[PDB]
């Protein structure tokens, strides 16, 4: 139908805007701490601690399959990256600290993304 096509165009355009959001957030992680899944070869107990692992590569795979229907879904996954790290790692670690800085800096980007998503519809 024409309506299904219109809906698909909307999804494609959200995907475009989320790709730009993802790039901007990933620039706030210049150490690449959050770039890839925590390795289960290197951290074999990880899934005993963290039940829903997340990382920027995994988000990118979902994004390119147009698997984010709305900004909330996307933000859920970004918050998992941060929140998983802040639980597994202690306060005094470069990992925890990187997550804090990513959260703080990403907030600004996400605040305007929400306005753009609402504004453009």
UniProtKB/Swiss-Prot annotation:
Tissue expression notes: Highly expressed in testis.
Origin superkingdom: Eukaryota
Covalent cross-link Glycyl lysine isopeptide (Lys-Gly) (interchain with G-Cter in SUMO2) as placed by the record, residue numbers: 41
Residues of the Bromo domain: 9-113
Compartments where located: Nucleus; Chromosome
Subunit and interaction comment: Component of some HBO1 complex composed of KAT7/HBO1, MEAF6, ING4 and BRD1/BRPF2. Component of the MOZ/MORF complex composed at least of ING5, KAT6A, KAT6B, MEAF6 and one of BRPF1, BRD1/BRPF2 and BRPF3. Interacts (via PHD-type zinc finger domain) with unmodified histone H3. Interacts (via PWWP domain) with dimethylated and trimethylated 'Lys-79' on histone H3.
Role played: Scaffold subunit of various histone acetyltransferase (HAT) complexes, such as the MOZ/MORF and HBO1 complexes, that acts as a regulator of hematopoiesis. Plays a key role in HBO1 complex by directing KAT7/HBO1 specificity towards histone H3 'Lys-14' acetylation (H3K14ac), thereby promoting erythroid differentiation.
UniProt name for this protein: Bromodomain-containing protein 1
Organism of provenance: Homo sapiens
């Amino acid at each position: 139908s024409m309506e299904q096509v219109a809906m698909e165009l909307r999804l494609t355009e959200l995907t475009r805007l989320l790709r730009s959001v993802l790039d901007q957030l990933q620039d706030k992680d210049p150490a690449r701490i959050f770039a890839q899944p925590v390795s289960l070869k290197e951290v074999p107990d990880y899934l005993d601690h963290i039940k829903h692992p997340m990382d920027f590569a995994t988000m990118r795979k979902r994004l390119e399959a147009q698997g984010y229907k709305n900004l909330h879904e996307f933000e859920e996954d970004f918050d998992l990256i941060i929140d998983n790290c802040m639980k597994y790692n202690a306060r005094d670690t470069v990992f925890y600290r990187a997550a804090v800085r990513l959260r703080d800096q990403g907030g600004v980007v996400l605040r305007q993304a929400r306005r753009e998503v609402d504004s453009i519809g």
